Symmetry: C6
Subunit: 196 residues, 6 copies
């Protein structure tokens, strides 16, 4: 995963953002992207190769892994990172557009319409963070149990399947939840600093 | 996959493009290339190694995987990215050619022929996006089912084969479809902003 | 693991830090991050693939590895690196904030509030280093024995499981402990140089 | 595969090349190098690991894969890329040599000998492209069939072996052929634009 | 293994070092780091996966590999590189400290204390090189034999285990020994050039 | 394998080298380093994993691979590249030393001693290229046969072992031989251009 281009754009957003916004971006880079690439990806590397079911039925392990893990937590976190970054890019684009328009007018910061877009950016960021949190909760909860009981065809009756690294995965699930909640708190602080 | 050179050329196109065009390029970088490299490639990594068939026939799994997946979705998306980028490079080359010709004439933006080429770029982009969408539909549909029934020689009679990660793959198929459709909408908006 | 962004921010902190602080950062880069990426990650690469249990029970090896290693040492060290870096980033952010405020005031180092934040940075760094050391001790100790005895369900009775590379892992555990203790000594020297 | 150095030299050639030459280089970068690294290498990754023969004879699969695939298509394409790039480097070296000689003479573009070398570059490029095309044809054709029949010792009698991903490989074979033919057309256009 | 940061610091040391010191650094980069990353790491890649023991005893191969190879040669060489680099960083830090102090004094090379630190750097470098050489000798010798006889529990009686690539590993062991001895000679030449 | 640092130093040598020397360096970068990293490394990737022997004897495959391949061709080529580069670095160091001495004298190209060192560089380059060629010949010849007959203990009597990819490996052996011989011819041309 090469996050270079998103990083380069979000550092530009850092130049035009509030101090709390700069904190939020630093959290995104260090506590989400960096952890994901240095720690979590490895943890989940053997998610299917080390997933085992007590059965001689061909195809059962495939369908049972798929049912247990419709989307890997790491993929979900990648999507979450991209969506919570997107409004920042929208605001930065509006910034660059107004700067280029100003340069043109000359040939021939946060107030006004730019402040309205900034605050909308903070709102959409908040809603997307909340949505991904709640989706993670309703899909997986905040804990991975070692045992998964599977009755999906072709599996005969109910089969016992065993997860790879349930405890380490639970640790990182809770870590990422905490980081997301810190991000929400930062957004709320941005909207209370702007309000005040 | 190293997209550095294409990125460097498309950022140049960003300098000479319309605001909606800049949005389109940002979508290309963040929602297609970045997702492909950070999420999808991994999902499809074990497409054949985890593909299983209920048979003792040597060679059956090979032919059945090949019939089920004549071209992996990720390869198709790579090709799609390159073709929908190509017209942008054509327009940028015409731009650079006219700039160098202007420098020469001095030694010894979007209107005129450059606007005609820009609009042709938007047209070919649209047609290629549509073509890849329709091709994906007629080849795979927009869903991967866990079970694939295969009767290709040497397989005896009909054999049951099981896909790796059908649900995660379906999620990303639909995600990439949505991103492609957003790109089409952006192209249409470019041609309506230029028209108006 | 791409530590580029954290490195780029901590080199900025190096520009605004004390000489002992510069030593601390150099230790972080060379004796923790570099070792982790060049040596330790490889050592732990086959932590589960080479973990073996004397049993025919499906799922036992999974649960036994998970119980023996709730979180891999390398993941723990990654987290430790990030948390002991975080206060440095806080102090650097306060620095940049005051510099930007000074530039603004002009339009329209370690003393004062900046020295208070610096010393708080050294305090939190110390507490986090100590906390990770003590956590490592209470979780794993400072030695990995080849034999792990496991009675976790589904394992029948008690099962003998064997670790991958116990001795090399012990060497690197003790190396990382020594590096952490050197870091603590450096922090103490920072607070005694500032006191004097 | 790190193509950085060749890229850096060919972009210099881009600075001193004709517009059609610039198109040719862009095709080389985007439709050959980028595809090879982002798509094809992966397709061929399991060329031998997923190659299967219906036999209990030790060593047969090795010799049969070797006979079927004396050189992998991807290696052949790497060589082709390097050889069709080489004349460009020769011309660029002559350019730099004349520029340095001019600087020396001062201390103490395409006409003349430089145009003769340019046209020889286009000729050798054409001949090498044609040679690699014809070699690919006589070695493999333009299609990979799933079944390979092998009678090489130690294989007893004739053995049935099955290819990995024959259809995807055929798609990329034909794609690379088309790209090579487009390159030939571009060379011919360079020599007709220079002639006219 | 990403040696970028250590390289960047040691090139700074190159700017402030003696000609023989520059030779030493070049040897470090080309004959130790580059070889380690381009050749040796691969040789040792399958050190445990290809290590085989003639036994049906679960866990024996694990304990026997661990006893034969308490620390892989490549990890040892990484540590050696870092420790023999460390004094160079100390000297460079003293250099930068004196330069910054000089700039401060202005606001408000090798002689003196800087020469004393340089010579201490050469001394510690020598002692660390010697220590790693002697440690390698007492741990492994300068040759890896194909056969390792193991009686460690759970192995029943004495078991015959076979090493991966003993001869290639011996070649690289002797190569790295020779490079270390060349480094020692260079240090001795530095101290004799400084003495004279 | 990261050749960045050697490349950066050899491009400096390119700035101070003869035109034929520049050709030699370009050959080194494009036809040796680039091929090695983009093509050959992959070919040899499964050298031991796909090496098979017709035996039930534990340890025989290990010893037989080791006897057949005491050092992999790719490792040998890496060493060859480094040694044939080394004299270039020596000459470049002498160049930089004289330039720094000139700057010092001012404070307080190829003729003279610099030409003597240049010609010695060409001589050592030639001798090392010849030595590696002859060593490759006496060790492996210029062809890898599929069958290797092995009688090394523990193998009972004589065992038949089969090589991975003998034909592709032979192709690349002959390619690298041809490239080395071209390099020798270039050296001879350097010494005849200097002589004349």
């Amino acid at each position: 995963g090469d996050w270079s281009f998103l990083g380069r754009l979000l550092e530009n957003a850092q130049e035009h953002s509030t101090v709390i916004g700069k904190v939020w971006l630093t959290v995104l880079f260090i506590f989400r992207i960096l952890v994901l690439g240095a720690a979590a990806e490895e943890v989940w590397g053997d998610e299917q190769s080390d997933f085992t079911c007590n059965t001689q039925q061909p195809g059962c392990e495939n369908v049972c892994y798929d049912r247990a893990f419709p989307i890997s937590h790491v993929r979900f976190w990648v999507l979450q990172i991209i969506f919570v970054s997107t409004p920042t890019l929208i605001y930065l684009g509006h910034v660059l557009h107004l700067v280029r328009m100003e340069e043109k007018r000359k040939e021939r910061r946060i107030a006004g319409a730019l402040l309205r877009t900034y605050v909308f950016n903070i709102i959409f960021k908040t809603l997307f963070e909340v949505g991904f949190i709640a989706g993670q909760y309703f899909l997986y909860g905040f804990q991975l149990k070692p045992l998964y009981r599977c009755d999906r065809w072709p599996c005969p009756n109910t089969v016992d399947c065993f997860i790879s690294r349930p405890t380490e995965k639970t640790i990182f699930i809770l870590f990422m939840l905490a980081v997301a909640c810190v991000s929400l708190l930062l957004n709320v602080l941005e909207i209370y600093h702007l309000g005040w």
